[PDB]
Design a protein around this ligand. Sequence first.
Ligand SMILES: *[C@@H](CC(=O)Nc1cc2c(Nc3ccc(F)c(Cl)c3)ncnc2cc1O[C@H]1CCOC1)CN(C)C
Length: 299
Amino acid sequence: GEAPNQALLRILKETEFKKIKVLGSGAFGTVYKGLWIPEGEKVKIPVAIKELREATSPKANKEILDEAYVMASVDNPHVCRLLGICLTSTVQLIMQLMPFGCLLDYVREHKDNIGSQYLLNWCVQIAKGMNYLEDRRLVHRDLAARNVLVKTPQHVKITDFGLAKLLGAEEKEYHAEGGKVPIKWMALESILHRIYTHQSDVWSYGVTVWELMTFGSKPYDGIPASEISSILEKGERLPQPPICTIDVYMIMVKCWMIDADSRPKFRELIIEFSKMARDPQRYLVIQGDERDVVDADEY
Ligand SMILES: *[C@@H](CC(=O)Nc1cc2c(Nc3ccc(F)c(Cl)c3)ncnc2cc1O[C@H]1CCOC1)CN(C)C
């Protein structure tokens, strides 16, 4: 029981775009800056590009072809979509350039400008996206300040569907079977059993926000991944951010529950911040508080 997909998937000649600067690389491959110059049309277009390492590993090719589908599919003010695809040997993902870039960086810079109404209107948008994804059976498995981008300070969108896995009908979870992971982010369920759910994704929406309110701050800084589980089991978590009123910090603790269905759903995280949004100064305390290219968003 689902309607027609009706999404577009754009295939591009490698010539239509040119990669300008390097943003990130690991084992996967690389993500370039670059700008796309549509065939025929003389109109330059800022984009970002993720190329992959290899060209012929069956499941690897399977994995990416899924990552595309998902990103093509999504349509949400706060979810980034796939512009198109290059189907060259080492497959490349074309995707819309967010000017200001990842939301982690952005708080590490502008913190002395950054204020209450924004940090709450941002959390609302992240919840909206995650809940929108939840609406469409999709699970992320890699939330983190990192994977949120800034179109404009009054608006953020969710990127990086590289660890996403879509779920079936009766299915309510997914078991991984080995792979590189962000340990100091995913849920305890996910670490000892390799289980993931939407309720695993909330947890990180916790860590994510904890990262926001602290203004970047490295989670479990120093402390390695090799007893994170043990640590959580003993019952230590990340400490109240200074600026956080207890009302807010609480929610973070609701998301670090060892019980999965005790953790707030994105449906209800949305409201807990939309509420706080109307009176942002009574939930966060930030001293000094009231102080020929084309964008592509035209088809
Ligand atoms: C965050 C800095 C950073 O990487 N910023 C950044 C990312 C970005 C993306 N990301 C992306 C990721 C996966 C993927 F599959 C695709 Cl297709 C894209 N996409 C579009 N535009 C982006 C802009 C962006 O920023 C801009 C600021 C300077 O120039 C780019 C720090 N982490 C690396 C830890």
